[PDB]
Amino acid sequence: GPSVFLFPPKPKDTLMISRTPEVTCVVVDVSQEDPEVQFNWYVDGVEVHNAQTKPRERQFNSTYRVVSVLTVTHQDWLNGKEYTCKVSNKGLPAPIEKTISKAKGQPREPQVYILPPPQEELTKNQVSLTCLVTGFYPSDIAVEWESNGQPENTYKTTPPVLDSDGSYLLYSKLTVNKSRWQPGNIFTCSVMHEALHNHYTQKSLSVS
Amino acid sequence: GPSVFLFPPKPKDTLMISRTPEVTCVVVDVSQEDPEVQFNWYVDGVEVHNAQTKPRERQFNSTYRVVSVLTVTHQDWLNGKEYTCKVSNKGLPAPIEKTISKAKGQPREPQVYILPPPQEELTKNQVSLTCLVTGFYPSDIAVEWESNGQPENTYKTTPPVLDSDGSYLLYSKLTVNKSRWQPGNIFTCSVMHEALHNHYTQKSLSVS
Ligand SMILES: *[C@@H]1O[C@H](CO[C@@H]2O[C@@H](C)[C@@H](O)[C@@H](O)[C@@H]2O)[C@@H](O[C@@H]2O[C@H](CO)[C@@H](O[C@@H]3O[C@H](CO[C@H]4O[C@H](CO)[C@@H](O)[C@H](O)[C@@H]4O[C@@H]4O[C@H](CO)[C@@H](O)[C@H](O)[C@H]4NC(C)=O)[C@@H](O)[C@H](O[C@H]4O[C@H](CO)[C@@H](O)[C@H](O)[C@@H]4O[C@@H]4O[C@H](CO)[C@@H](O)[C@H](O)[C@H]4NC(C)=O)[C@@H]3O)[C@H](O)[C@H]2NC(C)=O)[C@H](O)[C@H]1NC(C)=O
Ligand SMILES: *[C@@H]1O[C@H](CO[C@@H]2O[C@@H](C)[C@@H](O)[C@@H](O)[C@@H]2O)[C@@H](O[C@@H]2O[C@H](CO)[C@@H](O[C@@H]3O[C@H](CO[C@H]4O[C@H](CO)[C@@H](O)[C@H](O)[C@@H]4O[C@@H]4O[C@H](CO)[C@@H](O)[C@H](O)[C@H]4NC(C)=O)[C@@H](O)[C@H](O[C@H]4O[C@H](CO)[C@@H](O)[C@H](O)[C@@H]4O[C@@H]4O[C@H](CO)[C@@H](O)[C@H](O)[C@H]4NC(C)=O)[C@@H]3O)[C@H](O)[C@H]2NC(C)=O)[C@H](O)[C@H]1NC(C)=O
Numbered sequence: 195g196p197s198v199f200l201f202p203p204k205p206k207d208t209l210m211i212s213r214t215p216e217v218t219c220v221v222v223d224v225s226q227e228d229p230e231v232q233f234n235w236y237v238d239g240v241e242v243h244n245a246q247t248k249p250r251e252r253q254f255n256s257t258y259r260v261v262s263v264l265t266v267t268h269q270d271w272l273n274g275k276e277y278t279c280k281v282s283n284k285g286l287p288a289p290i291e292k293t294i295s296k297a298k299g300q301p302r303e304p305q306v307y308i309l310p311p312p313q314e315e316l317t318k319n320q321v322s323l324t325c326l327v328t329g330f331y332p333s334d335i336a337v338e339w340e341s342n343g344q345p346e347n348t349y350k351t352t353p354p355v356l357d358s359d360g361s362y363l364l365y366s367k368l369t370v371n372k373s374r375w376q377p378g379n380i381f382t383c384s385v386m387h388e389a390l391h392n393h394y395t396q397k398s399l400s401v402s
Numbered sequence: 403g404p405s406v407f408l409f410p411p412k413p414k415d416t417l418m419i420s421r422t423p424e425v426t427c428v429v430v431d432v433s434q435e436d437p438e439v440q441f442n443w444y445v446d447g448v449e450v451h452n453a454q455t456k457p458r459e460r461q462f463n464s465t466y467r468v469v470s471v472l473t474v475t476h477q478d479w480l481n482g483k484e485y486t487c488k489v490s491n492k493g494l495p496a497p498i499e500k501t502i503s504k505a506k507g508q509p510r511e512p513q514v515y516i517l518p519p520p521q522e523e524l525t526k527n528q529v530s531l532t533c534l535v536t537g538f539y540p541s542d543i544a545v546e547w548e549s550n551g552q553p554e555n556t557y558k559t560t561p562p563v564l565d566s567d568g569s570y571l572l573y574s575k576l577t578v579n580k581s582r583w584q585p586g587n588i589f590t591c592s593v594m595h596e597a598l599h600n601h602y603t604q605k606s607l608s609v610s
Contacts, residue, residue, distance in 0.1 A: 351563075
């Protein structure tokens with residue numbers, strides 16, 4: 195029979211208010227004369243009606259896959275609202291309800307540390323500036339790099355890494371050209387998380 | 403019908419003689435009264451007869467799961483030898499050949515750097531020393547931390563991270579009580595990977 199998969203908004207949508215944090219409910223495995231199924235949504239047990247439900251998409255494996263996206267506020271999601279996608283079929287003994295919400299647990303503020311290169315690497319053609327971030331719970335978080343004010347193109351971030359106390363940690367690397375490093379340019383890692391002042395913090399450094 | 407999953411030896415075991423590196427062939431979904439099945443092993447198209455096989459392990463979900471552990475040398479694996487576990491069944495008609503071998507690609511030497519704490523952190527009651535390993539390939543790699551010879555209990559390590567050029571990178575944090583950091587001690591990272599001198603390299607640092 196068919197199967198439901200409810201998904202959470204992005205750790206970056208949930209924090210900033212320019213983007214829209216959304217909650218996506220998905221159905222799969224709806225056979226070929228199973229008529230339309232119907233999203234009933236509920237937030238903490240009351241029916242909202244603003245979910246932009248989409249059409250009935252065909253799949254390579256000849257199934258029907260259905261989606262309903264539902265916009266939510268950041269206030270709401272981070273207050274621990276319990277969002278629910280109920281689905282009735284036309285050809286299924288039951289209706290299927292799934293529910294989702296923010297992670298439970300006393301949120302913990304990280305602290306950011308920029309780290310410089312190593313005195314070994316400074317002679318190299320490029321160098322690796324390091325943003326260590328640690329102590330953060332919940333695991334959902336976001337990092338960016340900017341330079342003089344202008345944002346940075348290329349960098350790489352590890353997935354969060356569970357720590358021995360139950361907090362999470364991660365590292366982020368930034369390759370910068372040996373050329374561009376020296377002339378006292380100034381570089382800054384910036385981090386977004388539930389438990390920050392303005393949900394936002396930066397460290398920064400120079401060639402000192 | 404039944405399915406066959408072949409699995410390689412882990413990087414640590416592939417890198418030193420002390421340990422024994424193994425190639426594991428696992429069949430799952432051998433049904434209720436379908437009798438035994440055989441492993442026919444081959445190495446680059448020649449049959450070896452040394453796999454320490456175990457007998458049929460029945461599962462919760464009511465199938466028969468079978469395993470054969472074949473042992474290899476390290477020179478064998480790093481020469482890129484192709485190992486195959488073929489399965490005769492007494493049920494579904496076919497043989498099921500499955501093949502495994504080392505990752506293809508010109509190996510790259512991991513360049514490793516210890517990084518000290520950040521000035522910021524020092525007033526905390528613990529500190530975080532950082533081993534950064536970059537530019538390595540294949541992704542199979544092992545990191546350990548020791549101090550005055552003795553190894554370390556707490557050390558976390560990110561899973562490798564694909565880089566913009568195709569090499570991999572990773573980080574490792576070591577938390578040490580500040581009571582251990584600042585009375586004159588020496589600390590050391592240790593890295594293992596095929597494209598190295600003696601498949602092993604280490605950096606080290608101290609309160610200078
Ligand atoms: C027919 O095809 C469809 C379409 O898929 C396509 O089919 C064929 C043609 C191939 O080409 C496929 O390669 C192709 O993808 C099949 O639909 C699939 O159905 C399976 C189930 O049979 C679903 O499995 C689930 O997967 C989700 C993860 O799905 C996300 O991530 C995938 C990649 O990571 C991505 O492909 C998906 O589209 C989806 O992607 C994310 O989507 C969100 C929302 O849009 C988006 O914001 C993200 O950015 C995006 N991410 C990425 C990386 O793209 C997974 O969550 C499920 O795991 C849980 O459930 C398992 C039980 O099935 C269980 O074993 C797990 O341990 C895990 O347990 C859960 O844990 C959660 C969280 O930790 C927790 O709440 C619970 O404890 C627990 N919950 C549950 C319910 O168990 C699950 O594995 C596929 O998502 C789905 N694919 C697509 C594309 O929709 C269909 O099955 C096929 N039918 C047949 C008969 O074969
Ligand atoms: C009945 O149950 C059994 C037992 O499982 C258990 O059953 C129930 C009771 C629950 O408790 C389960 O939670 C529990 O697991 C079922 O047996 C399972 O069968 C499925 C297949 O149906 C297997 O799926 C495959 O999984 C492997 C990974 O398996 C490793 O990792 C698991 C955890 O991550 C671990 O549980 C396994 O034991 C095994 O563990 C590893 O083992 C090695 C060797 O011993 C060891 O060195 C490792 O340290 C160890 N690791 C860990 C973390 O423990 C996965 O590789 C497969 O994925 C490939 O294939 C998929 C398609 O099947 C495909 O979607 C993927 O993309 C992927 O692609 C392959 O890989 C590469 C890279 O992508 C690609 O280049 C290849 O070309 C491609 N090849 C193929 C062929 O696809 C796959 O997902 C389970 O492992 C297996 N579980 C166990 C424990 O054996 C049984 O199926 C059940 N039967 C029924 C009817 O329900």
